[PDB]
């Protein structure tokens, strides 16, 4: 998270870490047994780490549950990063508490101007390489599709939305992918991509989760 701030221990309880030796992507806990992430973060043999603030130190509030099923969207395209959504089922149910809690799904899509919370343990430098130990947060407004399409000509699809600043400075970054973009307590987006980090006129693009609410619900029930 470039231009972010320390969230503060377990202030983002729904935030999970997709581990496979090292932290590679983020994610959200939508319910006791299901985690939502980005299809581009798909890896075989994932360990979902919950109750994490400082990823590098075992603060005892952690819960590490292996993934039993990984369900990537059928229409997902790696080239375009369209339909960059993936559902992961936990091997066992996460014990919900204060450090670990779920985030609700949206009933409607958000409007441009809506302030959202974007978080993760990803690169904080738009220039070099610097990764935090603790959880970083960033508040950014959902940009209008007019701005989004003008920022990325011929790249934005109806399943994507821009959030951040055309002045750059603040933006998600490498390693934040899969992470949550929560506006008003609803999971509205998933950290998908962007051209660089905090680049002027190049704000991060996120997966428009409200488009998949139906798919998600049917996927959750059947598996
Ligand atoms: O920073 C980036 C991208 C990463 C994706 N991206 C965004 C932008 C905004 N939001 C989400 C993702 C735009 C910048 N890259 C530099 C690093 N390369 S990399 O050599 O493939 C790479 C990949 C993973 C790494 C992990 C670590 Cl721990 C250190 C260096 C790494 C370097 C990929 C592009
Ligand atoms: Ca820890």
UniProtKB/Swiss-Prot annotation:
One GO location term (cellular component): extracellular space
SUPFAM superfamilies, per database record: Trypsin-like serine proteases
A single BP term in Gene Ontology: digestion
Compartments where found: Secreted, Extracellular space
InterPro entries to which the protein is assigned, alphabetical: Peptidase_S1_PA, Peptidase_S1_PA_chymotrypsin, Peptidase_S1A, Serine_Proteases_S1, Trypsin_dom, TRYPSIN_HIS, TRYPSIN_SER
Cofactor(s) listed: Ca(2+)
Residues holding Ca(2+): 52, 54, 57, 62
Enzyme class, spelled out: hydrolase
Post-translational modification: Subsequent cleavage after Lys-125 leads to alpha-trypsin. Further cleavage after Lys-170 yields pseudotrypsin. A cleavage may also occur after Arg-99.
Residue span, Peptidase S1 domain: 1-221
Residues binding substrate, per UniProt: 171-172, 174-175, 177
SMART domains assigned: Tryp_SPc
Stated regulation of activity: Is inhibited by scorpion cyclotide trypsin inhibitor TopI1.
Cofactor binding, per record: Binds 1 Ca(2+) ion per subunit.
Tissue specificity: Synthesized in the acinar cells of the pancreas.
Keywords: Calcium, Digestion, Disulfide bond, Hydrolase, Metal-binding, Protease, Secreted, Serine protease, Signal, Zymogen
Assembly information from the UniProt record: Interacts with SERPINA1.
PANTHER family named in the record: RIKEN CDNA 2210010C04 GENE, TRYPSIN-RELATED
Recorded family membership: Belongs to the peptidase S1 family.
Name listed for the protein in its UniProt record: Serine protease 1
Gene name as annotated: PRSS1
């Amino acid at each position: 998270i470039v231009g972010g701030y320390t969230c503060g221990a377990n202030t983002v309880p729904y935030q999970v870490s997709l581990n496979s030796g090292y932290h590679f992507c983020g994610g959200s806990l939508i319910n006791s047994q299901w985690v939502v992430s980005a299809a581009h973060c798909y890896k075989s043999g994932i360990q979902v780490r919950l109750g994490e603030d400082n990823i590098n130190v075992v603060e005892g509030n952690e819960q590490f549950i292996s993934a039993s099923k990984s369900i990537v969207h059928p229409s997902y395209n790696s080239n375009t990063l369209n339909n960059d959504i993936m559902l992961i089922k936990l091997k066992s149910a996460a014990s919900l508490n204060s450090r670990v809690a779920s985030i609700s799904l949206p009933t409607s899509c958000a409007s441009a101007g809506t302030q959202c919370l974007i978080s993760g343990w990803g690169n904080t430098k738009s220039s070099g390489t610097s990764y935090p130990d603790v959880l970083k947060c960033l508040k950014a407004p959902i940009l209008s599709d007019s701005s989004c399409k003008s920022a990325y000509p011929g790249q934005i699809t109806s399943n994507m939305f821009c959030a951040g600043y055309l002045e750059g400075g603040k933006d998600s970054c490498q390693g934040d992918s899969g992470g949550p973009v929560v506006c008003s307590g609803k999971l509205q987006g998933i950290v998908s991509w962007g051209s660089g980090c905090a680049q002027k006129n190049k704000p991060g693009v996120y997966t428009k989760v409200c488009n998949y609410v139906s798919w998600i619900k049917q996927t959750i029930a059947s598996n």
